[PDB]
Design a binder for this molecule. Structure first.
Ligand SMILES: N[C@@H](Cc1ccc(O)cc1)C(=O)O
Ligand SMILES: N[C@@H](Cc1ccc(O)cc1)C(=O)O
Ligand SMILES: [Mn+2]
Ligand SMILES: [Mn+2]
Lengths: 346, 350
């Protein structure tokens, strides 16, 4: 009998329940999460005319820098809350080459420690939600969300998994809105199909809170939407948006636009130009644009990890390039103005 | 309180991999055959062997008895063509949906109900039944849990077009005990499949399950037996001399040989195109194309496909797919004899 010839070992994993006791959610974390969800729901279904904003770092390698970022984001959020509902990006990895993410390599020293990773991720998420800021993250697989789901207001399925049956089944049992990205080829038919699929009940192999594989029956998720993110070209302009709307069946949730990634084509400086174009549409009465996504840090750009380890410029991304804090301020103020102007066209 | 499991109707218990592997024991012939298909696929894709690897059989197995019959014929044809073709039966369990049968694992009674436990039983009993006659099998690797129930029996695993980009499926592949084919993207380009073969070569840590059914961090070695499967897509069919040359142009140093799926995007919404694909491919091969080391074919006892009727399972035509349309046995046997001949020609040219 020949099995496990390419398995080096099975390493012990703390169960979700074990981590949920060890790093407990505060009342404020839990309330913050549920509020982010309600607000998101009202925006994507058209009941609120504010725009949903998912903004923050490409990924979080540094919990302390992330806390200092979050505080600025939260104060900005208090001021702009008439117009914008703000959820911080609390993403753990970048689509894989270079740094393997906070779950895999939380000490940013190219080793593995998935257990300490899940602890860091959970501690992060609690730290952020506890100051009253809702968070969003990528839904990576069927296991890790069980460690974190109590804290999350928004879940994303990346371009690379929108087609994946398992991620569509998973999205169908999650306790929050899920955005599906358009395919890496730059078409959205895959994200429309994901939304439809995810709206139905499925059965997938999940894990229970005690860390055992079990058959998991889902209810279906009515709060999935499509996220425009470019690809093979950019797709944030009015013609692209018109074609996107032409593909959504009646009763669709609103569209979200990502300013980064394929939309900014290899230059983070392009994010504010994406905002200008998206604001012009929203100002002019485009009610189908209900969300945006922005890769923002304290300081702009990105950096490689140098011979010296985790010790690295503070508040600078080690995955995708971000716009810096002051650009983010300008960018978000200008969006809120668009929002108010759309109100008056309406 | 916490707001979790709003959209979870429940959690049902699963027999563990090890429980199932005791309850449906593999025979010494099942285990030898699985090791043998592996060795042979390995030799072909890495160029130690000039036969062609053929993954051939139904789109999906909904009927164990009809597959068993299919298999008896395929094994007799294979005994006869073994100088030229290494044959592995498609023993696939699902098809990519948005209506339709949910597969053998989800819905083993083919009646729009769900019994996952009975389903993994049917799958594993099916793989034992097939491999027990000395026929090796391949299947799609769907997630990180199901393979743990069946991996002892598998010679070939496939990652479909819709998951080739998925990090989790690349990671899985890096720890599987057998060769893995990654299909090119639904857009008809293969960069995503080359990237996946590269990634799967490496060591990864993924969240899998032990043999006793508990989630564990599963550390892998890397899988040096991954290859690319050409299956068409939105750019067009890719089984022609030109497409293969553009394929070859993108393979990195160290890459294993190419497989050509005659079906799916390459049949272009018509199963009767698979013999035509074969001729075009058989022609390249016979004139000296050594970069084509594999083919994939959707084949059943009888041709075509069918919906599931109101009457249910009892209303089904025997030996006819309920998922993608397949060529019939007669036409498969022809396709495979011309294929075997192309391989013979190729030997002469070299
Ligand atoms: N047992 C599988 C490897 C595997 C698959 C899935 C899993 O969760 C763990 C381990 C093999 O020999 O190929
Ligand atoms: N607990 C998740 C649902 C879930 C995710 C993953 C899983 O394996 C089981 C169940 C939620 O509230 O969204
Ligand atoms: Mn990013
Ligand atoms: Mn098929």
């Amino acid at each position: 009998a020949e099995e496990d010839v390419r398995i080096l070992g099975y390493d012990p994993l703390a169960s979700p329940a074990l981590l949920q006791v060890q790093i407990p959610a505060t009342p404020t974390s839990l309330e913050t999460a549920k509020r982010g969800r309600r607000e998101a729901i009202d925006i994507i279904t058209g009941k609120d005319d504010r725009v949903l904003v998912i903004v923050g770092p490409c990924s979080i390698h540094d919990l302390e820098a992330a806390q200092e970022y979050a505080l600025r984001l939260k104060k900005l959020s208090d001021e702009l809350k008439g117009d914008l509902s703000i959820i911080m990006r609390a993403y753990l990895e970048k689509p894989r080459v270079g740094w393997k993410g906070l779950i895999n390599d939380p000490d940013v020293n190219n080793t593995f420690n998935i257990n300490k990773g899940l602890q860091s991720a959970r501690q992060l998420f609690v730290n952020l939600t506890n100051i009253g800021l809702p968070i969003g993250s990528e839904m990576l697989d069927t296991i890790s969300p069980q460690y974190l789901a109590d804290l999350v207001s928004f879940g994303a399925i990346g371009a690379r998994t929108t087609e994946s049956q398992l991620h569509r089944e998973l999205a169908s049992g999650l306790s929050f809105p899920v955005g599906f990205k358009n395919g890496t080829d730059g078409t959205l038919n895959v994200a429309v199909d994901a939304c439809q699929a995810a709206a139905h009940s499925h059965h997938f192999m999940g894990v229970t809170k005690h860390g055992v594989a079990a058959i998991t029956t889902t209810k279906g998720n009515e709060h999935c939407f499509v996220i425009l993110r470019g690809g093979k070209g950019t797709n944030y302009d009015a013609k692209s948006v018109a074609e996107a709307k032409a593909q959504l069946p009646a009763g669709s949730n609103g569209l979200m636009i990502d300013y980064s990634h394929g939309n900014s084509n290899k230059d983070f400086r392009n994010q504010p130009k994406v905002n200008d174009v998206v604001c012009e549409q929203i100002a002019n009465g485009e009610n189908a644009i209900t969300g945006v996504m922005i890769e923002s840090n304290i300081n702009e750009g990105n950096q490689g990890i140098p011979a010296e380890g985790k010790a690295l410029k503070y508040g600078v991304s080690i995955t995708d390039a971000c716009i810096g804090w002051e650009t983010t301020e300008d960018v978000l103020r200008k969006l809120a103005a668009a929002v108010r102007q759309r109100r008056e066209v309406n």
